[PDB]
Design a protein around this ligand. Sequence first.
Ligand code: PA5
Ligand code: A1IIB
Ligand code: A1IIB
Ligand code: CL
Ligand code: CL
Lengths: 551, 551
Amino acid sequence: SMASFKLATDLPEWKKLEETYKSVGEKFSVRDAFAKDPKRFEEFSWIYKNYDDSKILFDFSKNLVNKEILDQLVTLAKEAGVEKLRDAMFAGDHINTTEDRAVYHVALRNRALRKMPVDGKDTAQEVDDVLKHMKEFSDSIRDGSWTGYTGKSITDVVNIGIGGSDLGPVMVTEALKAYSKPGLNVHFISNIDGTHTAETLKNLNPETTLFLIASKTFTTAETITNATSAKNWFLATAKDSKHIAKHFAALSTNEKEVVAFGIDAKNMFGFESWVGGRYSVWSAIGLSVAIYIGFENFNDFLKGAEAMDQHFLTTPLENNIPVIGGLLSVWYNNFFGAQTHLVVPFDQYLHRFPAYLQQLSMESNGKSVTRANVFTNYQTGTILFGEPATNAQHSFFQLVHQGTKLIPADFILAAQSHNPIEKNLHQRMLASNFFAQSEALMVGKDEAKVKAEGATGGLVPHKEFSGNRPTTSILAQKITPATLGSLIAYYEHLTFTEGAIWNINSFDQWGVELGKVLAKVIGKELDDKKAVATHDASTNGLINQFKEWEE
Amino acid sequence: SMASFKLATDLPEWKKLEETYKSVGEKFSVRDAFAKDPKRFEEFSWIYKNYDDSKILFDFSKNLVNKEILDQLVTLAKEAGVEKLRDAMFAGDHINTTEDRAVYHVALRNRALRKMPVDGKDTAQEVDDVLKHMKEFSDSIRDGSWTGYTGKSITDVVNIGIGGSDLGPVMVTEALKAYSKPGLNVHFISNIDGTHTAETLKNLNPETTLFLIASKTFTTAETITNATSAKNWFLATAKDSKHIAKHFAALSTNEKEVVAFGIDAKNMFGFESWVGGRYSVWSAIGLSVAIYIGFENFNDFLKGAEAMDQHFLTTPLENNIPVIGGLLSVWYNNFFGAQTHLVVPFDQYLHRFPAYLQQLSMESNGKSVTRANVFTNYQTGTILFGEPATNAQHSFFQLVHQGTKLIPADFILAAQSHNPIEKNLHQRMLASNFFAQSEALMVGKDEAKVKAEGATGGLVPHKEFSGNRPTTSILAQKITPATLGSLIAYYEHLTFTEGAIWNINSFDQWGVELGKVLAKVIGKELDDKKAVATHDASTNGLINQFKEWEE
Ligand SMILES: O=C(O)[C@@H](O)[C@H](O)[C@H](O)COP(=O)(O)O
Ligand SMILES: COC(=O)c1cnc[nH]1
Ligand SMILES: COC(=O)c1cnc[nH]1
Ligand SMILES: [Cl-]
Ligand SMILES: [Cl-]
């Protein structure tokens, strides 16, 4: 086995952390910790400096953690060989053991052109060549030199893809929308549900719309179905297949399929097998971002990830920010038994950031088998969810404050808004909520205070707050491309750390296969007339009721 | 002392369910259940008939449940007085004990004009009179009789509101978008973040834009600030405040505060204290819906809720669809220890259905104190999350299939699409996924089958699927206004059932109420130049770093 251990439960520090949980962690008072340690904020906060000298404060000090606990977690990370696995990742080793592949999204943002080899062959130029092609193409869309079949500049660009071929481009174009150009819009078709195509294309002009079909194989069923429907929409107006070439490009490897579809092979933008879908927005898959906000902005976004990569690679564990966040996740997941991880951006542009992180985290770390090819009998990936604040405060934060579940939470705010309207009034209000919510989760409100505030009798307990509910606060200066690049890479490397401790392979996804195969079988049965009796009674029942109700 | 018991855990059936969990529940085999009971699908599926003779199938047969378990859960619901509390709700009794209020969203959709009294006075005509006002005004926007200040038809309707005054309008306008009219669009400003105002208003015309200021209290900080900024934007162009009367209306319980803001009382659409925000889309708060899709569609939506209300009120517990769903939730939450509940619509229109439910569910049932005014010694509300499929399948279903967490899931499909493009090809593909994903989660794939399919040695465990992962499948004919009204009411009444069992108040929200009075202290500190030391060191550190980095 390439693995140095079999199960996380084999590592000696695991039982020590179980005993620390019992003695110190279960009943941990964050209030008391601040009272005990005047330097607590200093000790449990870190400033990250980005390549452009901008900064991001990572404040972990309201978590259920102290020096003793964090030191034990760092010892666990050493026993798990986090650093060895990380170094092997950056070395190009095939640490995706089940697919026998490198894991080399870090090579996508190698703008410094460090030597970064796979199979002993540097990748730096091959990556950089695709980025230069991306710059050329995106520049031609943005400056009007690429025209549609009637000689008009492009106004709308539609990405068609599923999974990692959609969610990154969506989230990042939403997040960086302040950097867009009036009159050049992006759209994202992903669902096979034909609503998604019908509603997206309804008001678009075939003469000025450009499609990017995002699929490595160019044989992905939902994506190629969507792509074919979009091609039919285009041709309903254009009425000649020769026009396809001015309106369709591919984010793909499969030149025979692309060319068959009517796309000029010159307009295929490739990426390698060592790019995982949920780690792919840094690749050719990011073309829609480069078109929307310009290549130089996209490049700055890459350089922010690169800087965080360098932090992760070169920092001792006890000061390594993505490591610390991963260690705290393990602490809550495996010792407190918290099943979820909340992420709340106090930022409307970042409204799809939690959904992006949900794929990154859950698709990576929802695994039950270790690198030693044995079943875990301990918890692995958490369920990650969230919505932006302040909206979230009005809604499920009720349960975060007064429910019976521990919900570790990360709050994210920019000190500066891209839209500082009304002399920054909205922004000072937004910021006050950021600070106040984490404060309230810590401090709570005891029975005496509820009484002082005027409640009596049976009403009193209903108005109490436990406090000692943990948050991590992440304050950026401004959510620029660079900042966003660093923030995603933070979560990539947090996700890495978690998976390394659990000894899982964070980079495969075998779990998609069964439902795909079973869908193909059923699809054939939905094409046929007859009632079905080939499945369990529920599946048969559902299919047969559908058949009675369908068009 | 209105309560009939103190703690769920001390209901006599609770310990009997713990024993059943140990003996039959924990190791329940759904596969064996089907093999034992040839009628399992029929026994654990129910057809709901709506008022319009349309139908929805609720199949619970892939859950970890049998007759023995469900009969115990029904006994538990009887011991908890679910029926007595529900009857009190429908009588207008003040079952919201902590706020001393009726809970009477059911009266909002009383289209039959049954006697439904609060404080011994029928509400039927008062509710109906507001619906007539809504019909009049929405008709006048749609037919062009309500013009803007330069005599033009309204093209854009902007709702401004947050939480319960936002998420319903968002979700239902998205869900029922097939029923909208070209050239009449809706928009939703909610976040205090100035991005939300700036981006929403960027390309709208004040001459053809109508604002609905949606606030139960009409004092919410975010909303009143947002509404003031919108008025500033309007007056920048319109100049004369007399024009406001054509461009601003209010949805509220507080006439004095509306008129104080400068809105004419003739343009207020009222509701009462007994409408909770997360149950409010049925009231005046739904005006954006009636404008977008027409009042008759909105009325059909109400009538769907009313039909599900009648089902809930009149059906013995063992066949009562919302109750069965709530009983399964308690089973998973309290006996299996599953902390989450996944809701996945196989429907892109329903993309905001999970987020809406997240509010309804978590804000209702995230409580730690019972109706007997003692703290619980057991779990209450679950964490509800989800995204539409097929996007969700390609995001996080890896973990649903192969992770270490039990995640009870509800899947929802319509048999007929509003957009059956390409002769229903998309729709058949979408449906195949709906059936296959629930099939896959149940059947799994054992070691022998993985080997038969070609894996050897250490690769084998990585490709296994446990199966016996539960789902509920909900199959509608078509997601019409009526179907959606029934679906929401289903989840309202499921939420009621959970809360009744847990003996919590599902209708207050003392955490969300705190939130709305938290930020003002810090807000005053951000207005002042100086550094602060008035909080814990973390809050101080974050505020002071912010002050160094702000505009
Ligand atoms: O669920 C709730 O009570 C909140 O989300 C409210 O709906 C939100 O705070 C808005 O309150 P109001 O409608 O009074 O402005
Ligand atoms: C591959 O999908 C198709 O064949 C298709 C046909 N019509 C729309 N899409
Ligand atoms: C009520 O909020 C305000 O005073 C405000 C001022 N400018 C925009 N909003
Ligand atoms: Cl564990
Ligand atoms: Cl059984």
